[PDB]
Amino acid sequence: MSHQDDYLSVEELIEIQKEETRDIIQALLEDGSDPDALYEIEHHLFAEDFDKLEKAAVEAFKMGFEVLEAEETEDEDGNKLLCFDATMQSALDAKLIDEQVEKLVNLAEKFDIIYDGWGTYYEGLEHHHHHH
DSSP: OOOOOOOOOHHHHHHHHHHHHHHHHHHHHHHTOOTTSOEEEEEEEEESOHHHHHHHHHHHHHHTOOOBOOOOBOOSSOSSBEEEEEEEEEOSOHHHHHHHHHHHHHHHHHHTOEEEEEEEOOOOOOOOSSOO
C-alpha cells in the first residue's frame, strides 16, 4: 500500500534544487573555482514514448541546450527506457543553474517526461594515483 507517490508541485522541487545547488556551488567555490572558468551544466531527461521523447528533445535543443542522444536505460521500474541528456554552457551561479532547472522542469511537465537529475562537471584536476 503506502500511497506515498504523488509528485505534483514543481514549486517544491524548485525550492529544494535552490538550496542544494547553493550548497554545491559553495563547495565548488571554496575549492577555488572561478566564475569566468565557464561551467557546462548537465541535465538528464527520460520519457516513455519514443516519439514524445524526440519531441521534447527537439524543443529543448531549439531553445539552446546541447541535447544528447539517449540509450536503453533502467530505473528499477523500466529496465528498458530512453534517457537523453542536455548540456548548456554558462557561468557558475545558483540563480542561473536554478533557472535552467525551471525551464527544463516546466517544459518537462509541459510535454510528458520526468526531469530529475542535474550535475555540473568540475574542470581543474590536480593529481590522482601516483604520489598521494
